[PDB]
């Protein structure tokens, strides 16, 4: 219940909401049913429209006009956004030059330059260049700021989940808003866009950008505003909200429009109607910019022009029907669109199997455009899966496509043109970013980078400490003038062991043979020399990783490769080895096929053992450095030690064997020559961290040889591949994968063809970023560069994509 017979005389859009059952004027009112009985006729003046015109120029003062151009206005803080140029022969913001803004120029009474966080839904990022025609105010704020050429959104790639992402820097796993849509099983409650009830506190994790202000003492203007709310007043309110004192005025600000976005689902990403919606978004940053001006602080607030999502052609025609599929289709509930959830229609139904779904949903027709996932196994690259809230089967849709349950919903729910929602590489769904102000850069070009960074940013721009969060923070310090955050590199906890030679062949009872006693003062030196480092400085480019958690494990030194050797883990945690453009593949010899040699510096006890792997009957074993690129018949020794083997599945085996066969090889020649640092990944639990060993849920049979969830390689060259990896002079380039170590390959539907028709394109889906195994590994990677940290770390956060241009 609202007594909405108080009123909202001199409280419209107050920033501080009332308690109940007193009514309310603050923005949220309407989202509520709550706001005072003569709130539209006080705080949703449209009287005489937008803007001044040449005969209401020093008109006197009149109350029911939506804005002012009396002469009394700027300082009442509420003219017309044109006012000046209209009536006092001023220039639009848009028709000035650009310059430099080396300092705030701020009025007294500021206390830092204020952020105006300016956020448009639905703004692929094309439109950038294929709207430049009609959004010159946008055009300027990018050509004169700093702009990237598009920014990476979250998965899945909706509204809520990306602009939640935005204000927290969290993954919606971590943050709850898994999706516009919802049901959390602990609440048994459901979440929908319509009404007040999405509003409670329970569905919204982490700490947004405006509770990390209020609590840091820095006052926010509110964020969300209700869909009846003209634009045009949103930006008046926030001008208005600029010209309290001091002590009441918000440093903080969002505007947001659901343009282009609505009209895009209509019309298409590139109907001829998104024209219009495009020129109407630029004319409100024109209005934002105007008002600046007047109040002298379009050279002291920091603007952010920043998207949620893109925008893809989708039409009814390419839906997928799970009943086409599945005998069953009245059992399960579905989530549809360009994402499937799947779940139990009812809990009480035992005769309900998943993996009875998940195969009839499998490889089922030649052109299929979606692919069924156990959320586990979806790439880590989309962080979507340790929430209660993601259902355990998943559909990526293909772009282009919906799934959907039956045939009748989509007909009794062609409409639409356009859709958003797919796998956040996807270029369609790529955003935008364009930071202008005193604190980012001058005409400034940055590359891509994702919005889980934007808070830490914000955080900066702001002089707030981030709470904890997805971004790394320094990663965009690139996009700042000033207010750079300057981190430390994580201390290593554990130190290595550096083992020699302690043990006799006869002490290892492990089941292993190798043909290798074939027989020189020469050569036995040099042996010797690679045994304790001697090439290390070429297989080793950027320092050892750091470990960064307790645990046991020794260096280990080789011709051709370096590891770290957990006695925990009984198995490398990395392995890493350069591969010059002039390397030679060669093949591992008949008499050494099944070759497994004792590694006589680490002891029996801390080995793996042969006799596990025959006795497990699923389960086989890959090399970490490859056979494959030894550097020499002898060298190729080193490559069958027990402390460079690993637990694989032999379907995995197939993609492992391919990469280090052909597809290292193919990057070195393509790099000029690369550097790989490759190892295990156990994620039981998939909440993207490293597991401890009690969190383990599958052992080599009859061992405590632990089985890796994953496998990745982080592959390194120089930026500048005139220059070998080896001998690289400056900036790096990353390309990195998380592969899942699974006993089928039926994620891969062409499996069944040559490893040259299926492998890349599945490594290519388990693309990561260096950050991204970092959390899986509690690794630290390139401690030892020439490189600034905050380099480094944009490094770090690179995503090869494979999307073209
Ligand atoms: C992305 O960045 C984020 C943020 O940094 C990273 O997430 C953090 O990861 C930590 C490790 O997973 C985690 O730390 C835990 O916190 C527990 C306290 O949790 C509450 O308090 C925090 C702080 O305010 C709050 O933010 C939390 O918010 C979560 O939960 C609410 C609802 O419950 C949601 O609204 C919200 O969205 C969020 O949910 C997300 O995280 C939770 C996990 O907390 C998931 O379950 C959800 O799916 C969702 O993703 C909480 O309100 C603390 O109690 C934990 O301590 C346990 O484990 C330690 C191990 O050190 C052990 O010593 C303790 O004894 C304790 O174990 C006991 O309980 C166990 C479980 O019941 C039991 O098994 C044991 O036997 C013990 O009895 C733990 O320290 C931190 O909460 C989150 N923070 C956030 C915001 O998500 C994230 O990892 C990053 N991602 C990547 C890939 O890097
Ligand atoms: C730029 C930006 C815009 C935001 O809403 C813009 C908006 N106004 N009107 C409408 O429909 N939307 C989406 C929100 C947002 C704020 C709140 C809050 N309580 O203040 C709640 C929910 C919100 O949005 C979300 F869930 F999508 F995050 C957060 C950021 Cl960072
Ligand atoms: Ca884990
Ligand atoms: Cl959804
Ligand atoms: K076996
Ligand atoms: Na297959
Ligand atoms: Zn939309």
Redesign the pocket.
Known sequence: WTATSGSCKGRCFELQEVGPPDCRCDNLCKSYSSCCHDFDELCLKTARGWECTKDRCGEVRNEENACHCSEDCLSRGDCCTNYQVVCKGESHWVDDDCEEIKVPECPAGFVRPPLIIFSVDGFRASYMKKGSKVMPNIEKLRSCGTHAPYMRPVYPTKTFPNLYTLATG??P????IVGNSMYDPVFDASFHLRGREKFNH?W????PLWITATKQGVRAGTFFWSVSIPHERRILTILQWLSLPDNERPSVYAFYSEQPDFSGHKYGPFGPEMTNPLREIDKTVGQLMDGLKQLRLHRCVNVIFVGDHGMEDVTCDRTEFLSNYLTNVDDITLVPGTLGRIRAKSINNSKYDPKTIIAALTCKKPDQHFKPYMKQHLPKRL?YA???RIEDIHLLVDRRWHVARKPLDVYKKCFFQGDHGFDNKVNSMQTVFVGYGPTFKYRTKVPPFENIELYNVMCDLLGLKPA???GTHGSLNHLLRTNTFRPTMPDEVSRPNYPGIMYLQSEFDLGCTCDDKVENKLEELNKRLHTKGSTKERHLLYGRPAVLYRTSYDILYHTDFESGYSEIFLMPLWTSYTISKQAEVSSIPEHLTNCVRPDVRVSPGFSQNCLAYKNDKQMSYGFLFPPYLSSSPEAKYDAFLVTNMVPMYPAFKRVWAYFQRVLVKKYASERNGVNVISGPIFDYNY???RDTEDEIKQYVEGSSIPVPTHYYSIITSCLDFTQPADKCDGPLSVSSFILPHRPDNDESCNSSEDESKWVEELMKMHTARVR?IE?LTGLDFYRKTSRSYSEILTLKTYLHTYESE
């Open positions: 969290l993954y796993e971590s943050h709850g329970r919204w994790g982490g700490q962080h340790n929430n209660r904890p969060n997805n909440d993207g961290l991204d959390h």
